[PDB]
Amino acid sequence: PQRPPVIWIGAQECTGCTESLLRATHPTVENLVLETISLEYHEVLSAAFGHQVEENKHNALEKYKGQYVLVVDGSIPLKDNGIYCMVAGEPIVDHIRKAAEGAAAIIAIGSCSAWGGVAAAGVNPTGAVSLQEVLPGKTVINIPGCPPNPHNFLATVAHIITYGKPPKLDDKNRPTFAYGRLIHEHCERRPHFDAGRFAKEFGDEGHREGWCLYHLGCKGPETYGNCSTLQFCDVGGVWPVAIGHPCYGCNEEGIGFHKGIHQLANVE
Amino acid sequence: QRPPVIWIGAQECTGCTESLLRATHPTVENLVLETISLEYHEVLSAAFGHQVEENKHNALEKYKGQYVLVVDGSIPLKDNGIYCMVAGEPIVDHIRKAAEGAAAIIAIGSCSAWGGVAAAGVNPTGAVSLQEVLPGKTVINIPGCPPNPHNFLATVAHIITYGKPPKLDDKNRPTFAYGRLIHEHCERRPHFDAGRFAKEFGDEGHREGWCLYHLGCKGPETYGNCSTLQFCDVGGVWPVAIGHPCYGCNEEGIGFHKGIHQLANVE
Amino acid sequence: QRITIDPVTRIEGHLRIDCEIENGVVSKAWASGTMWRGMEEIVKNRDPRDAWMIVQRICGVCTTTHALSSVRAAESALNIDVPVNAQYIRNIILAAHTTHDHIVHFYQLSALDWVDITSALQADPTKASEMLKGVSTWHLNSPEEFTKVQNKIKDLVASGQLGIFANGYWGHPAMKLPPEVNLIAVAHYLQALECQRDANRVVALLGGKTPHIQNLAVGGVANPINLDGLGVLNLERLMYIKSFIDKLSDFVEQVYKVDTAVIAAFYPEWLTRGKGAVNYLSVPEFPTDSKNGSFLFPGGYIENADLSSYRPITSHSDEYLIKGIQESAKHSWYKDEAPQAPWEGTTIPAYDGWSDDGKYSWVKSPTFYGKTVEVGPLANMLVKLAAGRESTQNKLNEIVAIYQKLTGNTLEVAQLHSTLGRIIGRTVHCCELQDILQNQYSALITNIGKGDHTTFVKPNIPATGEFKGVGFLEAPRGMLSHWMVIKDGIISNYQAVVPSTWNSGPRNFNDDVGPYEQSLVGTPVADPNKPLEVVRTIHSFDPCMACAVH
Amino acid sequence: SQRITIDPVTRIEGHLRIDCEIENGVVSKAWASGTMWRGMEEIVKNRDPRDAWMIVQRICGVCTTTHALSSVRAAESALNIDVPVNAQYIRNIILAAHTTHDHIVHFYQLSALDWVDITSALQADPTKASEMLKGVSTWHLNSPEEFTKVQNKIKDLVASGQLGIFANGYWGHPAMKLPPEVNLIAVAHYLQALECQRDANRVVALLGGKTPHIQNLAVGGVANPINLDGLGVLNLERLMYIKSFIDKLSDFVEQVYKVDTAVIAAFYPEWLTRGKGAVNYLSVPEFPTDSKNGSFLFPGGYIENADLSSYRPITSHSDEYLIKGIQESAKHSWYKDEAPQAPWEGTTIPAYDGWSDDGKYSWVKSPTFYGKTVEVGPLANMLVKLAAGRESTQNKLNEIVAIYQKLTGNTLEVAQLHSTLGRIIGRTVHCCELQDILQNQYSALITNIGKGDHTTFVKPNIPATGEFKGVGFLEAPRGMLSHWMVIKDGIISNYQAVVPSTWNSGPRNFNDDVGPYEQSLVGTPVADPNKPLEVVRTIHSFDPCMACAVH
Numbered sequence A: 001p002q003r004p005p006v007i008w009i010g011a012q013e014c015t016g017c018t019e020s021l022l023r024a025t026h027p028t029v030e031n032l033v034l035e036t037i038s039l040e041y042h043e044v045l046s047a048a049f050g051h052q053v054e055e056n057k058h059n060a061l062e063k064y065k066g067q068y069v070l071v072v073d074g075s076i077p078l079k080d081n082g083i084y085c086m087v088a089g090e091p092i093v094d095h096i097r098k099a100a101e102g103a104a105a106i107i108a109i110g111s112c113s114a115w116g117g118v119a120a121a122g123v124n125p126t127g128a129v130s131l132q133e134v135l136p137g138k139t140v141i142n143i144p145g146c147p148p149n150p151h152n153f154l155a156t157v158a159h160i161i162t163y164g165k166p167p168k169l170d171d172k173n174r175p176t177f178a179y180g181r182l183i184h185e186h187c188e189r190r191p192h193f194d195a196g197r198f199a200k201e202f203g204d205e206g207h208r209e210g211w212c213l214y215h216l217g218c219k220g221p222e223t224y225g226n227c228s229t230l231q232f233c234d235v236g237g238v239w240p241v242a243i244g245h246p247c248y249g250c251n252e253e254g255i256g257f258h259k260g261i262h263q264l265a266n267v268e
Numbered sequence B: 001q002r003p004p005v006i007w008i009g010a011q012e013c014t015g016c017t018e019s020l021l022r023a024t025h026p027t028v029e030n031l032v033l034e035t036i037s038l039e040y041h042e043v044l045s046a047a048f049g050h051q052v053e054e055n056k057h058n059a060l061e062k063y064k065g066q067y068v069l070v071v072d073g074s075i076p077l078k079d080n081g082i083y084c085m086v087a088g089e090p091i092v093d094h095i096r097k098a099a100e101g102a103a104a105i106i107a108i109g110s111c112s113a114w115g116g117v118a119a120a121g122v123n124p125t126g127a128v129s130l131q132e133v134l135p136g137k138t139v140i141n142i143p144g145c146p147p148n149p150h151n152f153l154a155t156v157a158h159i160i161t162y163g164k165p166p167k168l169d170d171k172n173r174p175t176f177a178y179g180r181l182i183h184e185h186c187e188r189r190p191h192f193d194a195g196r197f198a199k200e201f202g203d204e205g206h207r208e209g210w211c212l213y214h215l216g217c218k219g220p221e222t223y224g225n226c227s228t229l230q231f232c233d234v235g236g237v238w239p240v241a242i243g244h245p246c247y248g249c250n251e252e253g254i255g256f257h258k259g260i261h262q263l264a265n266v267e
Numbered sequence C: 001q002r003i004t005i006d007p008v009t010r011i012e013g014h015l016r017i018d019c020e021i022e023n024g025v026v027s028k029a030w031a032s033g034t035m036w037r038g039m040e041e042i043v044k045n046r047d048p049r050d051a052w053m054i055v056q057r058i059c060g061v062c063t064t065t066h067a068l069s070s071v072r073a074a075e076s077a078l079n080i081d082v083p084v085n086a087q088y089i090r091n092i093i094l095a096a097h098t099t100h101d102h103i104v105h106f107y108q109l110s111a112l113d114w115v116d117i118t119s120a121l122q123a124d125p126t127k128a129s130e131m132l133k134g135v136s137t138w139h140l141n142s143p144e145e146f147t148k149v150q151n152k153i154k155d156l157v158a159s160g161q162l163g164i165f166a167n168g169y170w171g172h173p174a175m176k177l178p179p180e181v182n183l184i185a186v187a188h189y190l191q192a193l194e195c196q197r198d199a200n201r202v203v204a205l206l207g208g209k210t211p212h213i214q215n216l217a218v219g220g221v222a223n224p225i226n227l228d229g230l231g232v233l234n235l236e237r238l239m240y241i242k243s244f245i246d247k248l249s250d251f252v253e254q255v256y257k258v259d260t261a262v263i264a265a266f267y268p269e270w271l272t273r274g275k276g277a278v279n280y281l282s283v284p285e286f287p288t289d290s291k292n293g294s295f296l297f298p299g300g301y302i303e304n305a306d307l308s309s310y311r312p313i314t315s316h317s318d319e320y321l322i323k324g325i326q327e328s329a330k331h332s333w334y335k336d337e338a339p340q341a342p343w344e345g346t347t348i349p350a351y352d353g354w355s356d357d358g359k360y361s362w363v364k365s366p367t368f369y370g371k372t373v374e375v376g377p378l379a380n381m382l383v384k385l386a387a388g389r390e391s392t393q394n395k396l397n398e399i400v401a402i403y404q405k406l407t408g409n410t411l412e413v414a415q416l417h418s419t420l421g422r423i424i425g426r427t428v429h430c431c432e433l434q435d436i437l438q439n440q441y442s443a444l445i446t447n448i449g450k451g452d453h454t455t456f457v458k459p460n461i462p463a464t465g466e467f468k469g470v471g472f473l474e475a476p477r478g479m480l481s482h483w484m485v486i487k488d489g490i491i492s493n494y495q496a497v498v499p500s501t502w503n504s505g506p507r508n509f510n511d512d513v514g515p516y517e518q519s520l521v522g523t524p525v526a527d528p529n530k531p532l533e534v535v536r537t538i539h540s541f542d543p544c545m546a547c548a549v550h
Numbered sequence D: 001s002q003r004i005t006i007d008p009v010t011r012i013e014g015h016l017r018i019d020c021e022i023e024n025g026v027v028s029k030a031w032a033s034g035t036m037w038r039g040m041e042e043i044v045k046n047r048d049p050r051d052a053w054m055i056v057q058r059i060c061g062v063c064t065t066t067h068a069l070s071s072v073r074a075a076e077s078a079l080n081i082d083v084p085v086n087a088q089y090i091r092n093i094i095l096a097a098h099t100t101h102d103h104i105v106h107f108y109q110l111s112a113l114d115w116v117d118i119t120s121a122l123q124a125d126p127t128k129a130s131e132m133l134k135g136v137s138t139w140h141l142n143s144p145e146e147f148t149k150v151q152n153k154i155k156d157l158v159a160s161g162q163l164g165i166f167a168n169g170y171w172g173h174p175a176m177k178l179p180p181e182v183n184l185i186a187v188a189h190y191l192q193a194l195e196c197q198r199d200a201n202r203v204v205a206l207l208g209g210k211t212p213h214i215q216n217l218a219v220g221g222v223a224n225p226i227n228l229d230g231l232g233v234l235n236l237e238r239l240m241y242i243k244s245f246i247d248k249l250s251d252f253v254e255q256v257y258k259v260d261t262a263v264i265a266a267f268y269p270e271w272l273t274r275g276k277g278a279v280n281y282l283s284v285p286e287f288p289t290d291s292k293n294g295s296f297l298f299p300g301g302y303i304e305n306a307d308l309s310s311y312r313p314i315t316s317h318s319d320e321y322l323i324k325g326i327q328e329s330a331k332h333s334w335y336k337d338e339a340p341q342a343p344w345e346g347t348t349i350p351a352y353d354g355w356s357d358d359g360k361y362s363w364v365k366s367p368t369f370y371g372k373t374v375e376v377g378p379l380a381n382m383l384v385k386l387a388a389g390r391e392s393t394q395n396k397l398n399e400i401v402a403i404y405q406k407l408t409g410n411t412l413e414v415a416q417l418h419s420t421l422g423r424i425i426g427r428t429v430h431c432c433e434l435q436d437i438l439q440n441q442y443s444a445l446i447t448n449i450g451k452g453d454h455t456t457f458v459k460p461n462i463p464a465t466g467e468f469k470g471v472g473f474l475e476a477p478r479g480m481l482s483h484w485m486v487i488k489d490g491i492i493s494n495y496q497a498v499v500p501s502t503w504n505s506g507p508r509n510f511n512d513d514v515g516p517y518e519q520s521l522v523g524t525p526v527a528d529p530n531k532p533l534e535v536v537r538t539i540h541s542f543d544p545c546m547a548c549a550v551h
């Protein structure tokens, strides 16, 4: 049977969003590319290079017009007419706008494409923006995190394939199954928070009892995500807070890459 | 040479042994080939009958003072022990004999730890715990019905690796696994705090992953690591996460005593 | 002379087998369950909704089964139609559990009756691999895999600490495999452990853990279906389940199924002994409608081994099935001895020690309209053949084709009434269960897609009236039934009639012999001190004595 | 001459353009160009030193962990903090397990399709393929049945007409030399590799809190709470789980990856005679095991003009000779200040003016060591270990050579390692030796905890006035990494990363000397200038990471 086509374009990416796929188990990346989808363009894995891989892109955009899912990782730099990311001699923003024209669905994977992320932080040297900002007429599905659990992406794609539409989205176009709730509103250390049982320094007695990390700068109170429930890597028990480090708010615009690690969160 | 283990089942359902078949660190095959020498275990032993009895006697002699004794199931004392008879003798006698030479003794599961389901209701067979049968011995209790197998395996590993048991609470349960109420480390505590409660399975709140207190969750009165270590090492799998209240199976006087939907006392 | 095998190992629970041997052949046998808990009494006087969590602890090998039977019994009493999504979930759990259960039975519990690990040390790994060409497409039968396995055995033996392998029946005259096939089997024994672990990951993701699932309810299941929900059964979680379902098939089809044929090919005389009964019972299983029916697997009753005139059972409310079942305690350690219908059953302990002609077991003696009946995979396979189930005939044919390739001989249905036929029925079941899993996963995804997220119907339980219910289930070891009487809103009687009760039960009210005891007559015993041949036949029934006695 | 452009170079990390002048089918001159910049050095400026690691880790998600570790090391250097030994063990396990994943993925997912023809694999006899590996490997998943399963997956993919990542590959190219059987072997191993790298990252995740992008570090140590008796922390159950994954890596690494390295070399012996990038090599020692940021398990050093016998050992991350030699130029890069800059005095002022062959043509800076071009990465680290007389490295190389000799009848000399295939071999040797690092450091951790040491973190103080400077070195998967932090009035006043792919991929320098990528391509034969597979083969051997090179 024919598999649903996907076109993946990296902009100002660190490749962590692609690398997330290599940790996935349902599907594994090998099952993703051989059984679940046809990955028609992805520069990290493609056999073809240069003129050959450019041909692949053009052929796919034509053959699958109206049918492919476009995925973008990384921010898109608009300063100086787009020259901070040039592929085959052209600004990546141009490649992305072209591919968006024929897309059945468009996904910003990771905080960079979802809201600018680290690459757009602070002084923002390159005038980096989000995918949605470059595609004002399109509905961009945002899957933030730096990088997200890959299944936040894969189950979004699966919903599109299986049921013919995107999953339910919040008012930031994030899938509710993954981003519908604050981490702190579903965190196993909430009892400690409630009791005033707090780690004050890494390695202190409370830290070594698994107490709440609020006073270490945990951003769980202001970050939407599923890190405390879905967690990471499918081994069980693995997310930053469980390992002993506060949430940094990497999912959440205005938190991650803005607030200091040890800066305290606002609690609602 | 690998550290010897003698495993005796009393009034067991075999669930405590079966837990080992879910383990990953170690897997049961690595447990028996690399980590320990399982000198006696009737579920897996090639030998039967007289031959397996010889194995037991040989091991009790060869490894006197050195083996870890493990018991699953409750021990029935009513009517002089006849509710569990192996090779023509009450299991309590087999257990007391093996306890004599044990370097460490472990009650795996709620049945051996405190009597469990087999000792519940009217207690037809006068089932009691391993500690009750061995009053002069220190029994390490690893409750649960059955426990996550790593609550057992990491206890054994501590003994092997560092030459002593892990730190225990005042019920002789390892603190790494049983040191805290489930409700004092539960990811649905925010919902409890906010009054966001499932009222029936399948209702809107249940379908949003809200707190299961009003469905009868016994997390408030049950010590364990079910919300953190969870089960089966796949991620995200414990009763509450799947949608069902904790029943208190770890905890004497809770599991098998209180109704599923009976509300817990909150401290 | 008279021998005792106590304990029988590599079963669940506490079993004693006694045999009279005359002229090197078993002439008479006794089966004895030597441990009782009184689970039926423990659950009495409780709310019907609480029973399942307690009676699931009848057995942790056949975990899930008593939980499912219990909620079905309550639903029967109360006249509750279970939501179809709850059926799909229940079905996936039962099928995945049973896959684990059967694999472990063939390898961890049974193989060391047929397989000599000492002989495996003498094997040539290359020759062993070559033997399976055109027999299996399994990807882990290389000489290199087999050498790795051989080296682990070598190291174990070298250590002088044989552990679970100590004092096994190495070199026994009834051990017939060549060194190479012994090595193949040990390699598969170790590989089986990964496959069964994957099956239980399916179970865990829906049950909340295993052993002892925690997702049932009288009224359906506790799983909250919401594709768009955080922390609940959403599409990500379903994809995870699917990832494990898909890992089971290859081992089952390319290893377990093949090994079954291989053992048969080397032990063909075990197709001519170990017949336990001439009557067989199974219940239909895996309901797929909104009214507790439309089963994917058929059930029925075979009398005097006549498949052509069997009686189909297509409903768990079948009055013919319900009315036939009784249990006797004439030769069991209970007080009331006359045959009892389970809604009127008692379980009053009356231990008076062992007597050959009196009471000698904690297992009751079930009958169906007064006859002794074998239950379990042999029964379920024969019933499916009688029903003309193409899937079962085809799967049996695949095993036979391998056997024919190895031996030049074929297998007839008459040869299935045997120790090896019973093993074959179990293998066939395990193979067909993989299609159950694919079918029910697909059904669940499809149904959720139509907008049905219903999983639970809250029961009401009248505070007056007496209501009787029975929950049937085709368990790994055969037909299971839980019988609940509700009076004034609480359980006034609870009786479990469990598959190992049917098979292991002692002589009955008419002193007729049950399947285990019958199956042993005629067994040749080369060495009465090491009666391997007896244990081979008894293991074929997959004894579970916590189940049998409860 | 003819001019070609390869843009994008695929099967790397990031955005790379390679241009070549070809004379009579031989590359005469090359240009390497990093085509994307973020300004990560500028983004991290003016923050608390403690915050840097979480931000600069995002320089790269392929070499995740590395910039996080280098950043905390740089802050600790500035502040004069001695990291607790348990924190070192944990950092070391993470880096070694990460690097195991990274190298496996590089050999298989990034590089193999330069050497392997999947179309040819369809013609293979799976039994013959399995037979070829007898006495070469003891791997348990080389059966004909495994290979048939794999062959059928390829067949199905090709039959679907949706080749995806395999579409328009270099199938039938004249530089593809493997027999059908060896192509099928390699594809089977490509798929098997994905499970091994997943296991390596499970190690990383259990200590890091996730991967990509770990979250367990701190200036002062780590955030992991060691308590064997604690619920919800790093207890013995968690450590056993880590160990279960550590133990799963070795067999694939030793019996598949190591063997395939020798097999590829055996079929492509001309690639031992091209792809030399430099005559000078640098590596830093790695895996500190004492309480004072030293006692490294792996040695470092500097080799000049390929002379191992006279190399200079580096045994400290505070080595003044190393520190003082490092500069970067932007003469031919798109930045304003062009004279060589020591990184504590570095600037990164963008000055894009488009491509010029003789002017600026890259976002990568040009690093030098006392004014020389230097190759970094696994070839450098292998050669340095051989120069140090490290027996473990010589033995591991000898094992690869033994396989190669079994297949070819020939041995390999050190001279032949200064090549595309030598570079690949160095990476494999590294991956193999890292498995002993993991066992060693896991054992060290268990032992140390057993002695009663549960310390993991030393809280820093950061003077609110004064200006002070630190540098954090790390031997990353692609070579020596350094982060250079200046703190003034308690915040970062300068931050400069000098990254291994910067060394290798950098453009012509202040003296117009050619860096490793550009140098390595001179002499490359190109059969078909439209499809310059030979160029990509050499470039891929360096494991380019352009997010790293440019940041």
Ligand code: SF4
Pocket (backbone or CB within 6 Å): A012, A013, A014, A015, A016, A017, A073, A074, A075, A109, A110, A111, A112, A113, A117, A118, A145, A146, A147, D058, D061, D212
């Ligand atoms: S979201 Fe994070 S992991 Fe993904 S490209 Fe951006 S920096 Fe990298």
Ligand code: SF4
Pocket (backbone or CB within 6 Å): A183, A184, A185, A187, A188, A189, A190, A191, A193, A211, A212, A213, A214, A218, A219, A220, A221, A241, A247
């Ligand atoms: S502050 Fe962080 S660790 Fe504490 S309860 Fe909230 S999310 Fe959990």
Ligand code: SF4
Pocket (backbone or CB within 6 Å): B011, B012, B013, B014, B015, B016, B072, B073, B074, B108, B109, B110, B111, B112, B116, B117, B144, B145, B146, C057, C060, C211
């Ligand atoms: S504790 Fe539970 S699982 Fe273990 S023997 Fe008792 S009933 Fe069975």
Ligand code: SF4
Pocket (backbone or CB within 6 Å): B182, B183, B184, B186, B187, B188, B189, B190, B192, B210, B211, B212, B213, B217, B218, B219, B220, B240, B246
């Ligand atoms: S009552 Fe149960 S579900 Fe609710 S917070 Fe407590 S332990 Fe968790």
Ligand code: FCO
Pocket (backbone or CB within 6 Å): C059, C062, C065, C066, C475, C476, C477, C478, C480, C498, C499, C500, C501, C543, C544, C547, C548
């Ligand atoms: N299978 C199983 Fe257990 C038995 N006998 C039940 O039911």
Ligand code: FCO
Pocket (backbone or CB within 6 Å): D060, D063, D066, D067, D476, D477, D478, D479, D481, D499, D500, D501, D502, D544, D545, D548, D549
């Ligand atoms: N390895 C790696 Fe990335 C590069 N170059 C760094 O540091």
Ligand code: F3S
Pocket (backbone or CB within 6 Å): A145, A146, A223, A225, A227, A239, A240, A241, A246, A247, A248, A249, A250, A251, A252, A256
């Ligand atoms: S830093 Fe990111 S990965 Fe989750 S725990 Fe916080 S949103």
Ligand code: F3S
Pocket (backbone or CB within 6 Å): B144, B145, B222, B224, B226, B238, B239, B240, B245, B246, B247, B248, B249, B250, B251, B255
């Ligand atoms: S019922 Fe038992 S398994 Fe844990 S969630 Fe409650 S203690």
Ligand SMILES: [Mg+2]
Pocket (backbone or CB within 6 Å): A079, A080, A081
């Ligand atoms: Mg401008």
Ligand SMILES: [Mg+2]
Pocket (backbone or CB within 6 Å): C194
């Ligand atoms: Mg597996």
Ligand SMILES: [Mg+2]
Pocket (backbone or CB within 6 Å): C225, C226, C227, C228, C448, C453
């Ligand atoms: Mg839904």
Ligand SMILES: [Mg+2]
Pocket (backbone or CB within 6 Å): C040, C364, C495, C496, C497, C498, C549, C550
């Ligand atoms: Mg009964």
Ligand SMILES: [Mg+2]
Pocket (backbone or CB within 6 Å): D195
């Ligand atoms: Mg694996």
Ligand SMILES: [Mg+2]
Pocket (backbone or CB within 6 Å): D177, D267, D268, D269, D270, D271
């Ligand atoms: Mg060549």
Ligand SMILES: [Mg+2]
Pocket (backbone or CB within 6 Å): D452, D454
């Ligand atoms: Mg201490």
Ligand SMILES: [Mg+2]
Pocket (backbone or CB within 6 Å): D041, D365, D496, D497, D498, D499, D550, D551
């Ligand atoms: Mg720099």
